[PDB]
Amino acid sequence: DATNKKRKVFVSTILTFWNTDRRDFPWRHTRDPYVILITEILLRRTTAGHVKKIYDKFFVKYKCFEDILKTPKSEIAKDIKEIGLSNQRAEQLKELARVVINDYGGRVPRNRKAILDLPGVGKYTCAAVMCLAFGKKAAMVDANFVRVINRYFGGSYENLNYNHKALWELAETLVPGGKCRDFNLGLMDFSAIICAPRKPKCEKCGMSKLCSYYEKC
Numbered sequence: 308d309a310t311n312k313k314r315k316v317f318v319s320t321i322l323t324f325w326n327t328d329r330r331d332f333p334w335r336h337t338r339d340p341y342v343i344l345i346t347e348i349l350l351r352r353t354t355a356g357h358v359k360k361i362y363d364k365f366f367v368k369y370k371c372f373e374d375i376l377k378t379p380k381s382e383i384a385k386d387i388k389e390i391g392l393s394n395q396r397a398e399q400l401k402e403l404a405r406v407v408i409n410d411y412g413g414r415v416p417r418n419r420k421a422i423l424d425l426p427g428v429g430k431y432t433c434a435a436v437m438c439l440a441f442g443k444k445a446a447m448v449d450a451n452f453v454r455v456i457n458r459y460f461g462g463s464y465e466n467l468n469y470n471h472k473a474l475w476e477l478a479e480t481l482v483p484g485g486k487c488r489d490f491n492l493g494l495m496d497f498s499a500i501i502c503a504p505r506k507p508k509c510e511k512c513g514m515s516k517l518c519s520y521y522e523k524c
């Protein structure tokens with residue numbers, strides 16, 4: 308149906324944004340599974356700017372899970388106090404390190420279900436590791452991704468969130484093969500710069516012509 312063109316323009320718009328208004332963060336320049344997974348965990352409950360500021364010292368000190376597991380919890384907490392909830396985060400990092408060391412030889416598995424079951428890992432982080440580290444097709448769906456989908460596609464997707472399989476399935480089918488990274492990261496950037504939480508910047512949006520939400524305005 309014509310829903311084919313609407314989906315095609317969405318993907319096209321996002322892929323282009325990845326090349327025209329790309330944001331930058333250190334973790335977007337590595338493919339080490341450990342760094343990507345740990346960074347996604349550190350980003351929770353804080354901001355990219357905060358993690359970016361401890362990134363250099365953190366990854367020089369903790370080069371892998373072995374480094375985390377041998378370090379006292381209080382020392383780890385001290386090292387990441389800046390991003391908050393340091394003690395709770397330290398405890399979680401050590402548990403994750405313990406499982407990866409005890410069960411996977413200290414290396415993150417290149418398998419969806421294996422990753423998803425690691426301590427502290429949810430559907431979004433698992434998607435990030437699979438896509439960013441292993442280059443496998445996966446949609447990194449967070450609340451911001453949901454927002455764009457709600458607005459652009461509307462209809463039966465207007466009120467769904469990432470706890471709805473119907474919404475995650477659509478996201479999955481939108482991910483272009485061979486360019487999962489371009490799509491997920493381009494969408495992350497687009498959602499923040501253009502289709503923002505407060506007053507999307509529709510006049511700068513390239514797909515406003517097919518956007519459901521743009522019609523209600």
Ligand code: SF4
Pocket residue numbers: 455458459501502503507508509512513514515516518519520521
């Ligand atoms: S037209 Fe507006 S609401 Fe629609 S995708 Fe673009 S920014 Fe988001």
Ligand SMILES: [Cl-]
Pocket residue numbers: 338
């Ligand atoms: Cl490389």
Ligand SMILES: [Cl-]
Pocket residue numbers: 371372413414
């Ligand atoms: Cl290692």
Ligand SMILES: [Zn+2]
Pocket residue numbers: 370371372373374413
């Ligand atoms: Zn190691």
